Structure 1
Amino acid sequence: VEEVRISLPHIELAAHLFGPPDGKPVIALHGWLDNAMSFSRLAPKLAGLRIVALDFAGHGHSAHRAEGASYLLWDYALDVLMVAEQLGWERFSLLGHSMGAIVSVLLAGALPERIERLALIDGLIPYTGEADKAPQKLGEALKAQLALRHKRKPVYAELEKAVEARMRGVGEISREAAELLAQRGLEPVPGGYTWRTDARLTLPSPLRLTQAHALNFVRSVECPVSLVLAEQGMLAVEPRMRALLETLPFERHHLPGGHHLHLDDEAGAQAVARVFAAFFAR
C-alpha cells in the first residue's frame, strides 16, 4: 500500500507513502498549489525515513474543504495533526517546502511536544501584516469573498500546454518538475485538463500574522531545524531574511538552484538529500 486516502473528521486527504514502515516517521508538506509529487525525486533518496507525502486540502488528490471553510495556515496545521492522529504518531518529523515549511514552523512552535525535527526547503515564515493595515486587509478579504463566485478556472486542450502553463506560473521550475506535478495535479474536463484547485486558495487572509507573531513562532521552535536555502530563490535573496536567520540556531545550507531545487532535477534532489540524510541520522 503506497497510495492511501486518510479520513479525518472533517475532510479526506490523499497521501503517497515512501520508505520502510519501521522508518523514522515524517510528514512531507508541499508548497502552495503544488502536491505530493513535489517530493517524488527527494523522498526515495531519504532511506530510513517513513515519509507520508500529504496532499494539502484543495491540492493534488485531497478533497476540497466543505462550503464556507477557510484555507488559512493554521487550518492546514490542524489537518496535519489529525493526520498524525490517524497514523498513531505521537512525535514525528516534518519535511516542508515553501508554504509547507511555513506550516511546519507554526506546528513546531505551537506544539513543540509533537515535533521531533524540521527539514525545511526555501521557506520559513509567512508574509506578515501590521495592525495599522489590518482593517484595510480585512475589507479586502471580505470583498474578495463576495467576488469569489465569479472566479476563473483555466482549461488546456492538451497535456504539454498545461505543463508549460505551470513552468511560467508562480515560480520558475523545470519541465520535468512541471511534468511530475502534473501527474497528480491535472483533472480531466470537457475539452482537456485543468490544474485541480479550489478558487478559495487565491483569497487573501482576513488577518495576517504581524512580524512579532512570526518572530515568536520561530523563537518558540524547540527541536533541531535544517533549512535549505536556494541561491536563486528569493528567500535567500532577501536581506531582512539573512539578518533574521543569523539570530536563529537553525542549520543553514545554501545550495545552487531555484525555489523548487529539490524537484527541478536529480542533481538538486541529490544535493538536498545529502543535507537531510545527515540531519536525520543525528
Structure 2
Amino acid sequence: VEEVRISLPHIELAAHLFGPPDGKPVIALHGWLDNAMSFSRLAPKLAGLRIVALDFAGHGHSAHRAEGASYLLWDYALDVLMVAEQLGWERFSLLGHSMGAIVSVLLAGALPERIERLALIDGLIPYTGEADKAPQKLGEALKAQLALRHKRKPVYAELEKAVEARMRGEISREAAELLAQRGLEPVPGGYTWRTDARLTLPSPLRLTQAHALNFVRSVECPVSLVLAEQGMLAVEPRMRALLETLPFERHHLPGGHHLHLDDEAGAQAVARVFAAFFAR
C-alpha cells in the first residue's frame, strides 16, 4: 500500500508512501505547483525513513479546497499537522523543497514540540512585505479575487507539449515528466496541469521581515539546508548574510532549484547529506 487518501475533516489529501512502516516518521512537502513526485528520485535513497510524500491541497491528486478557502502558508501548515494526527504521529520530521521548506520552517517555529528535524531543499523564508505597503497589497488581493472566476487553465492537445510547457516555467525533461505523471489531468482537448485558480492569487497579508526572522529563530530542532549553487542563493545573496546568523547546517551543491529531481546525480548528492543528517 504505497498510495493513499488521507481524510482530514475539511479536505481529503493524496499521498505516496515511501520506505518501511517502522522507519523514522517523515512528511515530505513539495514546492509551488509541483506535487509529491518531486521526491521521486530522493525518497527511495533515504532508507530507514518512512516518508509520506504529501500532495498539498490543490496540487497533484489532493483535493481542491472548498469554496471561499485560502491557500496561505499557514493553511498548509495546518493541513500537514492534521495529516500527522490522522496517521497517529506524535513527533515527526519534515523533508521540504522550496515552498514546502518554508511551510516546514513555520511549523517547526510554531510547534517546536512536534518537529524532530528539518531537511530543507533550497527554501527557507517567504517573500516578505512591510506594514507601509500592506493596505496596498490587501487591495490588490481583493481585486484579484473579483477576477478569480475568469482565470484560465491552459490545455495541451499532446503530452510532450505539456512536459515542455513545464520546463519554460527551469528543470530537466525527466523532472518535468516525473511531475507530469502525477500532475496532469485529461480535459476534452488533451491534458491540463491540474491546479486551483486561487493558487495564483496575491496574498492579502505577507509576513514582515521581522515575522520571518522570528520564525527562523524559533526553530529548536536541527536543520539541514541544501542550497543549489545555481538556485536560491543565485537569486538572493542577501540570504547569505541571514544564513550566517543562523545555526542551520548548510551544504552548497551543484545544480538548479530542483537539483534533487533534475538528475540521479543531484538526488544522490542530496540523499547523502540527508542520510547522514537523519542518522545522528
Q: Which residue of 2 aligns with 1:209?
A: 207
- Rounded to whole Å, the distance in 1 between the matches of 2:196 and 2:236 is 30
Q: Is the 8 A contact 1:97 1:122 kept in 2?
A: yes
Secondary structure in 2 matching 1:149: helix
Secondary structure in 1 matching 2:86: helix
- Rounded to whole Å, the distance in 2 between the matches of 1:269 and 1:84 is 26
Q: Is the 8 A contact 2:29 2:97 kept in 1?
A: yes
- Rounded to whole Å, the distance in 2 between the matches of 1:65 and 1:96 is 21
Percent sequence identity is 100
| CA apart distance, 1:134 | 0.1
Deviations 1:169-203 (A, max 9, x none): xx500000000000000000001000000000000
Deviations 1:201-226 (A, max 9, x none): 00000000000000000000000000
Secondary structure in 1 matching 2:149: coil
- Rounded to whole Å, the distance in 2 between the matches of 1:254 and 1:105 is 19
- Rounded to whole Å, the distance in 1 between the matches of 2:229 and 2:54 is 27
Runs of 4+ in 1 over 3 A off after TM superposition: none
Q: Is the 8 A contact 1:186 1:195 kept in 2?
A: yes
| CA apart distance, 1:123 | 0.1
- Rounded to whole Å, the distance in 1 between the matches of 2:60 and 2:93 is 22
Q: Is the 8 A contact 1:188 1:194 kept in 2?
A: yes
Q: Is the 8 A contact 2:25 2:49 kept in 1?
A: yes
Q: Which residue of 2 aligns with 1:163?
A: 163
- Rounded to whole Å, the distance in 1 between the matches of 2:116 and 2:154 is 40
| CA apart distance, 1:234 | 2.9
- Rounded to whole Å, the distance in 2 between the matches of 1:225 and 1:234 is 17
Secondary structure in 2 matching 1:94: strand
Secondary structure in 1 matching 2:270: helix
- Rounded to whole Å, the distance in 1 between the matches of 2:63 and 2:113 is 29
| CA apart distance, 1:236 | 4.7
Q: Structure 2-normalised TM-score?
A: 0.99
Deviations 1:28-50 (A, max 9, x none): 00000000000000000000000
| CA apart distance, 1:10 | 0.2
| CA apart distance, 1:237 | 4.2
Deviations 1:215-268 (A, max 9, x none): 000000000000000001033542210000000000000000000000001000
Unaligned residue ranges in structure 1 (runs of 5+): none
Secondary structure in 1 matching 2:214: helix
- Rounded to whole Å, the distance in 2 between the matches of 1:235 and 1:72 is 24
- Rounded to whole Å, the distance in 1 between the matches of 2:242 and 2:256 is 21
Among 238, 258, 267, the alignment partner of 1:240 is: 238
Q: Which residue of 2 aligns with 1:99?
A: 99
Deviations 1:53-107 (A, max 9, x none): 0000000000000000000000000000000000010100000000000000000
Secondary structure in 2 matching 1:75: helix
| CA apart distance, 1:110 | 0.2
- Rounded to whole Å, the distance in 2 between the matches of 1:53 and 1:140 is 34
Q: Is the 8 A contact 1:229 1:236 kept in 2?
A: no
- Rounded to whole Å, the distance in 1 between the matches of 2:66 and 2:183 is 20
Secondary structure in 1 matching 2:150: coil
After superposition, residues 168-247 of structure 1 pair within 5 angstroms as 168=168, 171-247=169-245
Deviations 1:126-151 (A, max 9, x none): 00000000000000000000011110
Q: Is the 8 A contact 2:18 2:50 kept in 1?
A: yes
Secondary structure in 1 matching 2:68: coil
Q: CA RMSD, aligned part only?
A: 0.6
Q: Is the 8 A contact 1:123 1:235 kept in 2?
A: no
- Rounded to whole Å, the distance in 2 between the matches of 1:265 and 1:249 is 29
Secondary structure in 1 matching 2:52: strand
Q: Structure 1-normalised TM-score?
A: 0.99
Q: Is the 8 A contact 2:46 2:271 kept in 1?
A: yes
Unaligned residue ranges in structure 2 (runs of 5+): none
Q: Say yes or no: does 1:57 pair with 2:60.
A: no
- Rounded to whole Å, the distance in 2 between the matches of 1:6 and 1:110 is 23
- Rounded to whole Å, the distance in 2 between the matches of 1:249 and 1:264 is 28
Q: Is the 8 A contact 2:91 2:114 kept in 1?
A: yes
Aligned residue pairs total: 280
